[PDB]
Structures are given as C-alpha cells and as structure tokens.
Amino acid sequence: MDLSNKIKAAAEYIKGKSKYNPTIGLILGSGLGAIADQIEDAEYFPYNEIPNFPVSAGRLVIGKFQGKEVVAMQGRFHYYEGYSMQEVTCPVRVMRLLGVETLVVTNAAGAVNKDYTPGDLMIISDHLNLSGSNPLIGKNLNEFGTRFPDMSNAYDKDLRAQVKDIAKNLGIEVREGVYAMFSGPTYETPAEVRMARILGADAVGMSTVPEVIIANHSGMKVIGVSCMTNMAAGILEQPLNHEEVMETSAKVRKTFIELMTNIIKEI
Amino acid sequence: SMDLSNKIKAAAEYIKGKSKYNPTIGLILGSGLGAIADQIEDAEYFPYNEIPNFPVSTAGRLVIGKFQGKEVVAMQGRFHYYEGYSMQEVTCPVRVMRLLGVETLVVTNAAGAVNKDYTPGDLMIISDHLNLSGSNPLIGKNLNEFGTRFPDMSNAYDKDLRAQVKDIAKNLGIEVREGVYAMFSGPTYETPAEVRMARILGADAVGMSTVPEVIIANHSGMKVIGVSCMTNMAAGILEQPLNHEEVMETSAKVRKTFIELMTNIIKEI
Amino acid sequence: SMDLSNKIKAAAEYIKGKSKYNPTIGLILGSGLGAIADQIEDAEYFPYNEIPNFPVSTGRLVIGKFQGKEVVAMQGRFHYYEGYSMQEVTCPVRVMRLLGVETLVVTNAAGAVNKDYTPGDLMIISDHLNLSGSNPLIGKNLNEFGTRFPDMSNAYDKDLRAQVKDIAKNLGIEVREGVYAMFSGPTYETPAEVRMARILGADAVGMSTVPEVIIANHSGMKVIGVSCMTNMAAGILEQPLNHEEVMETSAKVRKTFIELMTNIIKEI
Ligand SMILES: O=c1[nH]cnc2c([C@@H]3N[C@H](CO)[C@@H](O)[C@H]3O)c[nH]c12
Ligand SMILES: O=c1[nH]cnc2c([C@@H]3N[C@H](CO)[C@@H](O)[C@H]3O)c[nH]c12
Ligand SMILES: O=c1[nH]cnc2c([C@@H]3N[C@H](CO)[C@@H](O)[C@H]3O)c[nH]c12
Numbered sequence: 001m002d003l004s005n006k007i008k009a010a011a012e013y014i015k016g017k018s019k020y021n022p023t024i025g026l027i028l029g030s031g032l033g034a035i036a037d038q039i040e041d042a043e044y045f046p047y048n049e050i051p052n053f054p055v056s057a058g059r060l061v062i063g064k065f066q067g068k069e070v071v072a073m074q075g076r077f078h079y080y081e082g083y084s085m086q087e088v089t090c091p092v093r094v095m096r097l098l099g100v101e102t103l104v105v106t107n108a109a110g111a112v113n114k115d116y117t118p119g120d121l122m123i124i125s126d127h128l129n130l131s132g133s134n135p136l137i138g139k140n141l142n143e144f145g146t147r148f149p150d151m152s153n154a155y156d157k158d159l160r161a162q163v164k165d166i167a168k169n170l171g172i173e174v175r176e177g178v179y180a181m182f183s184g185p186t187y188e189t190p191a192e193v194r195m196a197r198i199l200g201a202d203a204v205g206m207s208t209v210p211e212v213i214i215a216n217h218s219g220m221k222v223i224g225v226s227c228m229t230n231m232a233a234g235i236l237e238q239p240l241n242h243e244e245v246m247e248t249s250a251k252v253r254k255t256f257i258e259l260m261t262n263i264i265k266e267i
Numbered sequence: 268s269m270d271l272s273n274k275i276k277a278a279a280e281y282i283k284g285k286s287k288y289n290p291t292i293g294l295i296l297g298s299g300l301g302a303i304a305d306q307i308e309d310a311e312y313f314p315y316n317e318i319p320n321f322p323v324s325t326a327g328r329l330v331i332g333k334f335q336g337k338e339v340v341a342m343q344g345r346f347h348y349y350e351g352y353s354m355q356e357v358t359c360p361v362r363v364m365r366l367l368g369v370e371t372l373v374v375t376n377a378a379g380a381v382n383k384d385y386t387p388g389d390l391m392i393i394s395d396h397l398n399l400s401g402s403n404p405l406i407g408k409n410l411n412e413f414g415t416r417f418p419d420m421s422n423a424y425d426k427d428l429r430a431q432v433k434d435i436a437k438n439l440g441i442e443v444r445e446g447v448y449a450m451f452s453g454p455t456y457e458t459p460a461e462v463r464m465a466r467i468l469g470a471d472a473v474g475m476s477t478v479p480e481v482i483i484a485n486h487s488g489m490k491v492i493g494v495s496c497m498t499n500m501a502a503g504i505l506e507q508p509l510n511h512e513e514v515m516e517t518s519a520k521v522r523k524t525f526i527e528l529m530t531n532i533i534k535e536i
Numbered sequence: 537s538m539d540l541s542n543k544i545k546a547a548a549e550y551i552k553g554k555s556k557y558n559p560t561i562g563l564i565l566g567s568g569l570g571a572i573a574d575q576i577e578d579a580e581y582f583p584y585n586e587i588p589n590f591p592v593s594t595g596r597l598v599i600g601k602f603q604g605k606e607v608v609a610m611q612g613r614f615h616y617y618e619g620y621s622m623q624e625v626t627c628p629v630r631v632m633r634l635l636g637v638e639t640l641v642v643t644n645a646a647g648a649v650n651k652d653y654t655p656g657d658l659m660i661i662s663d664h665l666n667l668s669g670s671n672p673l674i675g676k677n678l679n680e681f682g683t684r685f686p687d688m689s690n691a692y693d694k695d696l697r698a699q700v701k702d703i704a705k706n707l708g709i710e711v712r713e714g715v716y717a718m719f720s721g722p723t724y725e726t727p728a729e730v731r732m733a734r735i736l737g738a739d740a741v742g743m744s745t746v747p748e749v750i751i752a753n754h755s756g757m758k759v760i761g762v763s764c765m766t767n768m769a770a771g772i773l774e775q776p777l778n779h780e781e782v783m784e785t786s787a788k789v790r791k792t793f794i795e796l797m798t799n800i801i802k803e804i
Pocket of ligand 1: 107108109110111187188204205206207229230231232233240241242245685
C-alpha cells in the first residue's frame with residue numbers, strides 16, 4: 001500500500017465508525033487537552049487501533065463543540081521522538097479525508113522576543129523551518145495538492161484578524177510574531193537563540209511547522225496560537241526545564257481555553 | 268561507495284559505447300530552460316529510463332552533439348532533492364558526465380529574486396551559494412577516483428569564467444546581475460519570513476537546486492558557471508501567491524535572450 | 537533486536553571486565569594531539585573493531601594514568617561526514633559515561649571566522665551553533681542517561697572555562713574564547729556560508745564536536761572544548777583550503793596545545 005493508500009485506509013476505517021462530518025481539526029499542544037475532553041457526544045479512536053497510524057496512548061476525539069463538528073488529537077507525534085516527517089503529519093492527511101477544512105494548531109514555545117512575558121499568547125503570523133527536513137519531500141500526492149504549494153498565507157490572514165477581534169472583545173491580551181521550529185529535543189543554546197532572533201524568530205519550538213505545511217498543501221486554512229511558557233534559553237540566567245514549561249502552560253491555561261472556545265464557535 | 272562508483276561507470280560506459288562524441292562542455296537545464304538542447308547539431312539522445320542505474324522518474328534525456336564548435340552533453344531535465352532522491356542520486360549524472368570527458372559545467376536554474384532591485388526576467392550570474400537544504404551530496408565514503416575527501420569551495424563558481432560571461436553579455440547588450448543563490452530543500456515555496464531570513468543570510472535568489480550539482484562538479488575537478496533566471500520575486504515581496512505556472516511563463520518569455528547569452532558563452536569558453 | 541540501550545551496555549561490559557580502571561575524565565582528541573594518548577601510562581588498549589557494537593571503520597580506546605588522573609582517550613573519532621548516523625558518532629560518549637567519566641575534554645581543528653584570530657590560535661568554546669541538520673538525541677530517550685529535554689544553557693561549563701583561562705595565564709599561552717559552528721561537511725564552506733556563519737554569531741567553523749557535546753551534557757557530564765584555528769575560514773583570504781595545511785598548522789602548535797591539555801587535566 002503506497003503512502004496514499006495507507007492514508008485512505010485509515011480514513012475509511014474512521015469514517016465507517018463515525019456519525020460525524022468534522023469540519024474543524026484540532027492539534028492541541030500546550031496542555032489544552034482539556035478542550036478535547038469537553039467535546040460532546042464524542043467518538044474515540046485510539047492510535048493503535050487505526051490502520052497505518054504511527055505506533056507508540058493518544059487518541060482521536062470526534063464530536064460536537066460549540067455547534068461545530070470537530071476532530072482533535074490528544075497526544076501529538078513529534079519529530080524528535082524518531083518519527084519521520086511523513087509519520088508526524090499522517091494524521092493531518094487523514095483529517096482532510098474526514099472532511100476537515102480548518103486546522104487549529106496550538107503549542108508551547110520559548111519567547112525569543114525580549115518584549116514578551118511568560119504566559120503571553122502569540123498568534124503565529126509566519127514560521128521558519130529550521131529542522132533540516134520537510135514533510136512534502138518525496139512523490140507528490142496529487143489527490144491532496146499541487147507539487148509546489150504556496151506558503152505566502154500559511155496562517156490565514158483573515159482568521160488571524162478574527163482571533164485578534166475575538167481577543168479584544170474578551171479582553172485577552174495577545175501577541176503576534178514569527179515562530180521557529182528546531183528539531184529538538186535539546187533546548188536551544190544561548191547562541192542558537194540569539195541566532196533565531198537575528199533570523200527573525202519571535203518564538204522557538206519543536207513542532208507545529210510540519211502539520212502547518214501539510215494542512216496548507218491539503219487545502220486547509222490554518223490558525224496557530226503559541227503559548228510562551230518560558231523566556232528562550234539565552235535571555236535569563238536560569239536553566240530551561242520542562243516541568244517549568246507545563247507549569248506556566250497550566251497557569252494561563254484557562255484564558256487560552258476561553259480564547260480557543262470562542263474562535264471555534266465563530267469560525 | 269563502490270556500488271555507486273560501479274553504477275556510475277556502468278552508466279558512462281553504456282553512453283560511450285553508443286556515442287560518437289567526446290564532449291568537454293556539460294549543460295544542466297531546469298525545465299523552461301531546456302530548449303537550448305534542441306539546438307545541438309546532429310545530436311544523440313539517451314532517455315534516462317534507458318541508461319543503466321540512472322534514477323527512475325515519477326521523460327528526461329541526455330542530448331549529446333555539436334554546438335558552436337564544441338562537443339557538449341546537455342541534461343534535458345534535472346533530478347531534484349524534493350522528489351525523494353538522495354543527494355547522491357541527484358548528483359550521480361554529474362559523475363557520469365565527468366567520465367564522458369566534461370571539463371566545464373554550465374548550470375542553469377529557475378529561482379525567486381530575493382534582491383528587491385531585481386526584476387522578473389533578469390539573469391543572475393551565480394557568484395556563490397548558500398546550502399540551506401539540510402543535506403550534503405558528499406556525505407558518506409569519498410569517491411577517490413573523482414576527488415579529494417575535503418574539497419575546497421572558495422571558487423565554486425569560477426571567477427575567471429564569471430568575468431568572461433560579464434564581458435560577453437556586455438558585448439551583446441544583455442543586462443545581467445551577479446549575486447548569491449540560496450538553495451532550500453523544497454518542495455514548498457518559502458514563507459515570507461524565510462525569504463527575509465534568506466536576505467539576512469546574504470542571499471539574492473532562492474531555489475531548490477544547483478547547489479548539489481555544483482558541489483559534485485567542483486569535487487570532480489570541473490569548472491562551473493551558474494546562470495539563474497529570476498522567474499518571480501521571492502515570496503512575501505509582493506502581495507501575490509507563488510505559482511509554478513508563473514515560473515514557466517517567465518522562463519518562456521526570456522528564452523530568446525537566455526539562448527543568445529549561453530550560445531555565445533559556449534562558443535567563447 | 538538488541539536495542540541501542542543494551543548495545544551500549546555490552547560495550548561497557550566488555551571494557552569493564554577487561555579493565556582495572558574507573559576513569560573520570562574523557563578525552564576526544566583530534567587536533568592531532570594523539571601524543572596525549574601516547575603519554576598515558578600503564579595503559580590498556582581497546583581497538584574499536586573489538587569493542588562490541590562500536591561503529592565500523594571503513595582507532596582505539598586508551599585507558600590509564602595521566603597527570604594524576606585516570607582517563608580514557610578516544611584516539612580517532614567518528615565523523616558525521618563519513619556517513620555515520622548521529623547515534624554511531626556519539627555512541628562512545630555513552631560508553632565513556634558508563635566507565636565513570638564525569639568530565640569531557642574535546643579538542644578539534646576549526647576555521648577561524650573571527651578576523652581577529654590568526655592561524656595557530658587556541659579558542660575556548662563558550663557555546664556552539666548546530667548547523668549540521670541533525671541531532672544525536674532524536675529518537676527514543678535513554679532514561680538511564682538523562683532527561684528528554686536537556687537544557688543547553690551551560691553546554692561548556694563556565695567554571696571550567698574560567699579555570700582554563702587561569703591555567704593559560706599562568707602558562708603564558710594566548711587564548712581566545714568564542715562560539716563554534718558545526719557544518720556537516722565534508723566540503724569546506726563557501727565564502728558566502730562563512731559570511732553567513734559570522735552573521736549568525738559564530739567565531740569558528742568545524743565538522744565535529746557538537747554531537748559529542750550534546751550527548752555529554754545529556755549524560756550529566758561537564759564539557760571543556762578547545763578549538764585550534766588551523767586556517768582562516770574560507771573567503772577571508774584569496775587562497776583555497778585543503779587538509780594538508782590544516783594538519784601543518786595543527787603540528788606547528790602541538791607543543792603549546794599539549795602543555796595546555798596536560799595542565800588542565802592535572803588541575804581539573
Ligand atoms: O524554549 C523552548 N524551546 C523549544 N521547545 C519548547 C517548548 C515546548 N514544550 C516542550 C518542551 O518544553 C516541547 O513540546 C517543546 O516544543 C516549550 N519551550 C520551549
Ligand atoms: O521562488 C522560488 N522558490 C523556490 N524555488 C523556485 C523555483 C524553482 N522552480 C521550481 C518551482 O517552480 C523548483 O524546481 C524550484 O527550484 C523558481 N522560483 C522559486
Ligand atoms: O575551515 C574549516 N571548516 C570546516 N572544517 C574544518 C577543519 C577540520 N579538519 C578537517 C577538515 O580539514 C575536519 O575534521 C574539520 O572538522 C579544519 N578547518 C576547517
């Protein structure tokens with residue numbers, strides 16, 4: 001089965017066991033899994049039961065949310081754990097076949113812009129791929145998109161205006177800047193963070209960019225919000241630590257959920 | 268590797284056994300630029316799917332014959348790293364052309380103009396390059412019959428030959444630019460942020476090719492001239508999506524001037 | 537079917553059962569500096585092609601006494617440009633940790649991007665940039681060595697770096713300090729890529745060191761990096777780069793380099 005058939009086999013499996021035509025995809029990262037656990041009349045598809053899914057826990061949650069039919073990944077597949085870029089982004093392809101037209105991606109990142117504070121929410125206006133790989137390398141899947149997809153509106157400008165307008169109505173302070181993905185799993189060095197600032201990055205992370213590339217190629221609109229869980233490694237004298245990342249993510253979590261619940265109602 | 272070396276020589280011996288020519292000039296043409304191969308005289312034709320160990324495509328051909336007093340072999344169609352080939356698969360035809368006798372390589376490509384003073388249709392003499400792809404064609408065991416383990420890259424695009432191209436274009440009235448070409452892996456078009464980073468790194472043009480061939484060319488002992496056609500302004504400069512149909516149309520509108528430059532270059536080389 | 541975790545265990549098991557030593561300092565020498573390992577006394581030799589699961593060549597481990605310390609030296613390292621994976625390149629560091637190594641001393645030869653330097657200078661590495669395109673920690677995390685997301689704010693120990701500078705001052709050895717950028721290789725950089733490297737904040741460009749430093753820090757080891765500027769980085773001068781001259785410049789200051797290395801190992 002070519003990668004093309006393997007994607008379709010996973011989609012026909014879910015479609016044959018689903019009452020839903022989900023229109024919004026959710027890749028929740030910054031501890032926003034609580035959003036998935038509030039989906040109504042949910043169907044659950046764990047990854048190990050879906051054919052051709054990446055192996056080794058997480059699950060797909062499909063159901064109702066603020067009048068929208070959604071599908072959400074609980075756990076994410078990461079490039080630093082050893083998965084290929086094709087395995088990392090396969091759930092996005094299956095999402096397209098389930099009917100997804102708008103993808104909402106959230107993550108946790110380190111603030112490179114010295115004007116940010118941990119806890120801030122940065123709408124992703126653009127990204128820099130600094131990992132050394134590309135998920136579209138290989139034979140093009142013509143049933144999904146063109147060989148040379150455009151990336152001038154990777155994070156839909158009109159959707160970004162909607163988030164800003166929604167955040168203003170709710171009184172939620174929001175930032176907007178360029179996200180940069182490193183492969184990981186090492187935290188960046190102080191010199192690499194200064195390099196990221198020079199290249200134009202406002203935040204650094206280890207995800208998001210692969211699925212945003214595939215979602216655009218598959219004909220989806222993409223909206224991305226990154227939660228600054230820490231200052232990037234070079235800016236403060238304290239060492240970076242993942243227990244600190246989850247903690248800061250948990251502090252501003254409720255505001256993040258409120259912002260993300262309102263956009264899905266209004267998309 | 269020995270397997271690669273065997274398969275490279277097996278491809279060249281196949282071509283040599285069926286060819287009348289001993290070419291010294293090589294050409295690598297990137298799609299909307301392959302029409303100059305149609306002007307090679309009494310040409311021989313070798314489709315890639317008939318040459319042993321040539322990478323299978325997802326139908327490009329070698330064109331060998333006379334051109335402006337020289338004997339040339341032109342790659343009508345090149346293999347790209349974004350299609351899934353390894354770096355060694357992408358560049359192994361350059362090794363084949365070397366065993367064919369090629370001493371000077373003319374690399375052409377289509378690229379997006381990062382320099383805001385450039386215009387779609389301009390021709391850029393590649394003076395240097397930035398490898399931003401995340402791979403190197405020489406990683407692995409060295410092919411000792413072709414070059415050294417640590418090849419120098421200080422004159423990758425021959426300075427004397429760039430000066431000869433600048434004088435030929437001046438003699439013909441052809442405006443030519445000269446700048447640095449950056450290669451991304453592809454097949455995505457760069458984001459506006461990646462284009463601004465490309466300018467910060469010192470790049471005047473962005474493309475998805477050239478760099479791997481130039482590395483293997485210089486490693487093999489060949490001189491290289493790079494002429495990149497500005498088929499579009501790089502992403503984010505204008506308020507337009509980037510489209511492969513635009514790349515093809517601009518390549519087609521500048522073909523006449525591009526043929527006249529290269530035709531004279533090959534004669535005076 | 538033996539996982540990476542047990543392959544490293546078997547390598548350490550093989551060396552341990554054949555060694556009376558528990559070295560605390562690891563030496564990845566490469567700026568020539570093979571004489572350092574020659575001066576290891578009462579030494580035990582472990583050829584690479586005899587340690588189980590070590591990467592295949594086309595080198596040896598030296599363990600013994602040095603300046604009051606018990607050390608294990610890597611005589612000849614594995615490079616990413618030769619085709620080894622990032623895990624094959626750094627596997628000896630995992631083995632060195634199981635042998636009890638607490639501090640890693642990495643030397644190399646690099647091209648000087650900073651125009652202040654002159655060929656022959658010695659630069660303490662204060663930080664690095666990974667421009668190779670890979671990372672030796674990508675894959676399943678080895679829980680017995682370190683954490684999933686290791687911090688890299690002190691990749692080259694600051695207190696140790698100051699001790700080198702004190703030792704270099706009492707010895708009268710000139711010393712620079714700057715950032716090391718690792719390209720993949722094996723090509724020498726282009727003049728544009730060198731200009732890019734400086735814009736990125738790099739003072740030297742090389743083809744190694746970065747993978748070992750990442751794995752050493754992940755395993756809980758302190759790292760000292762010393763780079764010898766064997767040449768001006770490409771484009772800085774109007775002459776080509778080649779390996780014969782890198783080795784000539786490494787040879788011209790081996791004595792001075794070796795005074796520094798013998799003294800720091802003594803005072804660590
Ligand atoms: O400063 C950072 N650099 C890189 N990644 C992260 C993250 C994200 N959280 C996780 C590791 O803290 C991981 O998913 C990573 O993408 C938070 N802060 C940073
Ligand atoms: O702006 C650009 N960015 C990247 N590649 C290209 C190209 C080249 N042409 C093809 C894409 O249209 C592809 O082979 C690439 O190398 C033209 N313009 C651009
Ligand atoms: O200017 C340079 N660029 C990249 N590597 C090196 C080296 C080192 N010596 C070897 C290549 O000459 C290799 O180990 C590389 O790490 C010396 N100078 C340079």
